[PDB]
Amino acid sequence: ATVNQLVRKPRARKVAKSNVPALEACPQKRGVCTRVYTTTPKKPNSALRKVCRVRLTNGFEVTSYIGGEGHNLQEHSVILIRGGRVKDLPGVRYHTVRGALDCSGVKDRKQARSKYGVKRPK
Amino acid sequence: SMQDPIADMLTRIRNGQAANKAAVTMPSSKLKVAIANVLKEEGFIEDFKVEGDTKPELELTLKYFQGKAVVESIQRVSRPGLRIYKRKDELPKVMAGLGIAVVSTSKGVMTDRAARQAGLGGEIICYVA
RNA sequence: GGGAGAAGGCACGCUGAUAUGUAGGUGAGGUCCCUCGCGGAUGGAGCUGAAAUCAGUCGAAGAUACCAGCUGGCUGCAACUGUUUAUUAAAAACACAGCACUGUGCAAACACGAAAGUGGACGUAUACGGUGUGACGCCUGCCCGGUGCCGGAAGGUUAAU
RNA sequence: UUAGCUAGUAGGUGGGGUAACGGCUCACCUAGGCGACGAUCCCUAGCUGGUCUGAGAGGAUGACCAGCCACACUGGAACUGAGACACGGUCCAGACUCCUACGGGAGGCAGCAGUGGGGAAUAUUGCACAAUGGGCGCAAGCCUGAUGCAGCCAUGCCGCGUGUAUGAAGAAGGCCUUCGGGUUGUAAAGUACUUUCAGCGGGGAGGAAGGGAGUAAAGUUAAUACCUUUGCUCAUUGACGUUACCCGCAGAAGAAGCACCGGCUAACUCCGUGCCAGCAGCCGCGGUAAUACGGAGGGUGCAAGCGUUAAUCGGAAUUACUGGGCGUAAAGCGCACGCAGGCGGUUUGUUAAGUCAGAUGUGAAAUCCCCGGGCUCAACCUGGGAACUGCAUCUGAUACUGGCAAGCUUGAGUCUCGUAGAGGGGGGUAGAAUUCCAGGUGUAGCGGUGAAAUGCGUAGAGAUCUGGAGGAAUACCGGUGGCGAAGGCGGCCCCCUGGACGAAGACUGACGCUCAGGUGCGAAAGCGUGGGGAGCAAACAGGAUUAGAUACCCUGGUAGUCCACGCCGUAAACGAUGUCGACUUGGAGGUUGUGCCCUUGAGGCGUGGCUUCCGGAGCUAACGCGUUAAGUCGACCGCCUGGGGAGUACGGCCGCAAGGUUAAAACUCAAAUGAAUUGACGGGGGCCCGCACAAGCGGUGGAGCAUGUGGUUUAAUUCGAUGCAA
RNA sequence: AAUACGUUCCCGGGCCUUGUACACACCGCCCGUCACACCAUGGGAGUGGGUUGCAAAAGAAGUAGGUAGCUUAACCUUCGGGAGGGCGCUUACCACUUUGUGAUUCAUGACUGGGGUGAAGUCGUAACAAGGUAACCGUAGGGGAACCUGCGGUUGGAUCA
Ligand SMILES: [Mg+2]
Ligand SMILES: [Mg+2]
Ligand SMILES: [Mg+2]
Ligand SMILES: [Mg+2]
Ligand SMILES: [Mg+2]
Ligand SMILES: [Mg+2]
Ligand SMILES: [Mg+2]
Ligand SMILES: [Mg+2]
Ligand SMILES: [Mg+2]
Ligand SMILES: [Mg+2]
Ligand SMILES: [Mg+2]
Ligand SMILES: [Mg+2]
Ligand SMILES: [Mg+2]
Ligand SMILES: [Mg+2]
Ligand SMILES: [Mg+2]
Ligand SMILES: [Mg+2]
Ligand SMILES: [Mg+2]
Ligand SMILES: [Mg+2]
Ligand SMILES: [Mg+2]
Ligand SMILES: [Mg+2]
Ligand SMILES: [Mg+2]
Ligand SMILES: [Mg+2]
Ligand SMILES: [Mg+2]
Ligand SMILES: [Mg+2]
Ligand SMILES: [Mg+2]
Ligand SMILES: [Mg+2]
Ligand SMILES: [Mg+2]
Ligand SMILES: [Mg+2]
Ligand SMILES: [Mg+2]
Ligand SMILES: [Mg+2]
Ligand SMILES: [Mg+2]
Ligand SMILES: [Mg+2]
Ligand SMILES: [Mg+2]
Ligand SMILES: [Mg+2]
Ligand SMILES: [Mg+2]
Ligand SMILES: [Mg+2]
Ligand SMILES: [Mg+2]
Ligand SMILES: [Mg+2]
Ligand SMILES: [Mg+2]
Ligand SMILES: [Mg+2]
Ligand SMILES: [Mg+2]
Ligand SMILES: [Mg+2]
Ligand SMILES: [Mg+2]
Ligand SMILES: [Mg+2]
Ligand SMILES: [Mg+2]
Ligand SMILES: [Mg+2]
Ligand SMILES: [Mg+2]
Ligand SMILES: [Mg+2]
Ligand SMILES: [Mg+2]
Ligand SMILES: [Mg+2]
Ligand SMILES: [Mg+2]
Ligand SMILES: [Mg+2]
Ligand SMILES: [Mg+2]
Ligand SMILES: [Mg+2]
Ligand SMILES: [Mg+2]
Ligand SMILES: [Mg+2]
């Protein structure tokens, strides 16, 4: 309000925590699948999403979301996890990146093959 | 409590201009007379005359051009809660030169152009536009 | 207020300097004095005399003998100090301050007394007696069907006469 | 939500010690020192020039390079040494690893490489001292994993190429289509012309200055010996290096992918599914026409790069010093006093601390910017300039602020006289009224509700009259009236006292405003003690409605409401508007003074204090505020930064307790909000109409008869209409 | 034929105003216990660590002081030795380590309190109209739940003299 008040109490910031705590400011983290299954979204739209509870290397255990159709991953599978959450699924804050150590890419993919780790067709 | 006679004078003249007052009488002071001299030397006011022996009063007469008031905005910059001092090369420029910023300096209470020509700063008082 | 001496730790003998015995207490002889002797102002010759530092020294051990707390935590009961079955039970058993109810207007209730009389009390409802629980913090929630107690005598029964 | 810390601790005398001053150390004496301008403690963190972002102020950050500090398996120590308590030095203790004859010993890659684990990820056990430097040496000469360079990685920046000019049979195929068409498209094929880059073969700078061997001259001495220096001639020297670069060969070959296409944002049509498969940063899509999913065609962006992820800045004026608000969205402490602090009426003189001018030193180099140069351009390098917004000193300026000394009354406070007031505390007094006690008259009801009953009644209720007992508040006056900082205050009288205003008069002379801590007051409810208790009334008992009604209603009824002393400090403590100063049009009042006029009426003309309503300018998102501003300012304090979680838990304090105060974090959400607008609704109001009721008349529902519907049965009882409107 | 006093009332409709938390628009909205799943938290008898405070024990090497011994290249000697030095021992400082008791933080802990998101769940309708008891604020009591009652204050309440 006034300079006399502001010199006594400096204008503090409004720092907000990140939405990806388990990454610890890291683009990618390697984890091992623990519980691969299917869940249902919330009220606005009904579907059957594919999710996986995975224990990260540092110690955190999170729930990712498998992208695309077709995933050969299962329990005890090494996967790579990046940021980005799913709006219509509560709890998920990360995405499993395809083309990883064991996460195979989507079969017969022609468009946006890089986002799903698909070799360029001949 | 009255803690800023210059701000009181600025408020009085602004209210007089807003309400279309011919002249605004008020208690005066040496700094008030010095500021009124600068205001009259720039055509912002008609004239002024100190009246009184023990309690001098300034009687500033406003100027109206085509109905609308000549002075647009008079803003007290350096208030007695935050003093503002500017060097010769850091003086402000109201409306890119169309307005004035009264500055009290070692040689007296002059304007931006006078201070820049003389080559010395001072502390600002108010912007008149 | 306490727990608390919580728990747990270091010194303790002897000799020498400090001081050939310090501080402190007691405390004479010399000098003014008097409203003059069992008197006051200075005065420390003395004997007494802790407590600590410094250094040295002897033994395995210096509160070296006798005397002379084991400690802490988790819990039930009782508030605590006391009293209790002399002579197998000392306690959770009684008492306790605090609290509640009840009766008691003085020639008071009650108790001892065939009665006088006394205690209550040479007190007067902030007093006395009895009955319950028993320091203190939160509370004493519902019910008079039954037995006691009180208020009423409208109706029924009812002794002696 | 870390408030007290410090006893070698602060100072002093003397001694000792360091190269140097110093409790650095010792013995003694003093009881001091730090601290709301944050002492002590916890977590985190190498610092700076700098870098990113930002117009700026700012925010983030410490990659490379450069300056400083610390470290060398961990800890402690000392010696040599001018320089260390020392990376490849010493000693000791602990772990690890290794050899052993079991007695005993060896080592510290957070150096260059490289190995093993961690990770999402970080390079080859490469060449050379040829140059720039270092160490040794008079020199020659040796070392140099610094350095000069080579290798890998698109990790970042810059440049180039992946051909160009023709080329409409608008080739063929694909895409969709209205089957006529257009799209791919000069795109392709074909013709002509170049060879940058990659490859082959030759030529070939610069990074090279230095050094040795002789010769002429100068300085030297006794000397033409020996040395140094100056010129001259031949030897000489490169890891990079198949160097940069230039030239000839031939062939258009060897060289383009990624992301997106519903809005934000530049790009649309079909095919495959059908809230399934799936997309997503938000809004959200898919339930058979998906420009949103997957593919195809087409289009857009970038380009040896393209998207995702993680972090920073901007947008975010969304911590607002530049640059916000607090009546209603979040935001005025319930109010008052007041310490530190913040600010401060008016004149003179003085000081010149801030401020303003000039000069000096410094603000490293590096980096940014400006003007030029070199690399074929650029990246990159480089010369000069500017800048480094800062600090210290000197010489002046005196308007402002600040310090000092004198003045003044306009701010403020006081006297003298009246005025009004439910202002506060204490003590008395008088009636209305309610409830009980006693008595008299009096008989079958009283009370209550939409209606009923619980309840009171033949033991005489209710009613009436008399006397008595006790509690609370004082009908009319009584009002948008008054007082008080707020809460709050209502019969009358007395006692003590606070506050406000006005007529005229003089001094005191800035004594003035606000206020973090702190203190005090503080509705009602609540608790403790000792009383009181008429009425009312939580809890509770009974009756009643209702499916249920632990409520609204009725009959009783305890705490409480009352008194005195104590405790909490909560409210919609509201004008949802913190205190003061002055300025800025008016009307109608209310209350209370005061001056003068013929006061013939509450006649008029002025001036003050409080307060109500309307309203102009102005302000606000609007409602609304509007001289008592929510209009323009000045001084100060408090508070707000999305809704929940929550004013919740923990923690400190207060409190007998109830609870109060200070006050978070994890997690979820795309909103949560206020003023107003148009509908709709109200067991809201006002007005009006219609056989809609009221006054009729006749029928329907009763018992067969003619029809349609529902269900039943069948092979069908064919299908549709399924409230008024079948 | 009869009857129509008047809109008091049922139904449907027309206009103005008022309040609204409704806008597929009251067949609207919407609250909290209770059950089930998941998630993040406080309490929790205790459990295992990190860091660290206080009071002590502890004496490897290494520094400085002291000398009952052991010895001795430089100097001096009066030729025996002396001065001085080293070794050993001891004292002072200190590291590893050890004992007792506290503070902070992390994880865990049977059980338990509150919170959030959930799928045609069960129970009722408290707030939004005069929401049909007008809600809200402070407080005390009571109840399965929203909530009810008494006390003090506000209209951020609708009609009417
Ligand atoms: Mg003595
Ligand atoms: Mg037991
Ligand atoms: Mg006992
Ligand atoms: Mg007990
Ligand atoms: Mg005992
Ligand atoms: Mg016994
Ligand atoms: Mg007697
Ligand atoms: Mg007992
Ligand atoms: Mg008790
Ligand atoms: Mg009982
Ligand atoms: Mg009875
Ligand atoms: Mg009886
Ligand atoms: Mg000294
Ligand atoms: Mg910006
Ligand atoms: Mg660094
Ligand atoms: Mg090494
Ligand atoms: Mg290495
Ligand atoms: Mg690995
Ligand atoms: Mg070299
Ligand atoms: Mg070598
Ligand atoms: Mg074709
Ligand atoms: Mg060369
Ligand atoms: Mg899109
Ligand atoms: Mg900003
Ligand atoms: Mg704002
Ligand atoms: Mg608000
Ligand atoms: Mg609100
Ligand atoms: Mg207020
Ligand atoms: Mg308060
Ligand atoms: Mg100065
Ligand atoms: Mg200057
Ligand atoms: Mg150039
Ligand atoms: Mg520089
Ligand atoms: Mg001055
Ligand atoms: Mg008075
Ligand atoms: Mg305060
Ligand atoms: Mg009260
Ligand atoms: Mg009652
Ligand atoms: Mg009642
Ligand atoms: Mg009471
Ligand atoms: Mg409050
Ligand atoms: Mg308020
Ligand atoms: Mg005040
Ligand atoms: Mg008033
Ligand atoms: Mg108005
Ligand atoms: Mg609380
Ligand atoms: Mg109704
Ligand atoms: Mg009409
Ligand atoms: Mg816990
Ligand atoms: Mg020791
Ligand atoms: Mg030793
Ligand atoms: Mg309701
Ligand atoms: Mg109801
Ligand atoms: Mg309401
Ligand atoms: Mg109740
Ligand atoms: Mg109020």
Coordinates of C-alpha atoms (C1' of nucleotides) and ligand atoms in Angstrom, one line a residue, chain E residues 41-44 46 108-109 111, ligand 49:
Chain E
rU41 C1' -3.5 -36.1 6.4
rG42 C1' -3.7 -35.2 12.3
rG43 C1' -3.8 -38.1 17.0
rG44 C1' -1.6 -42.6 18.4
rG46 C1' 5.7 -47.7 20.8
rU108 C1' 7.1 -46.8 10.4
rG109 C1' 3.0 -48.2 13.9
rC111 C1' -6.5 -48.4 16.2
Ligands
MG49 MG 1.1 -40.0 12.2

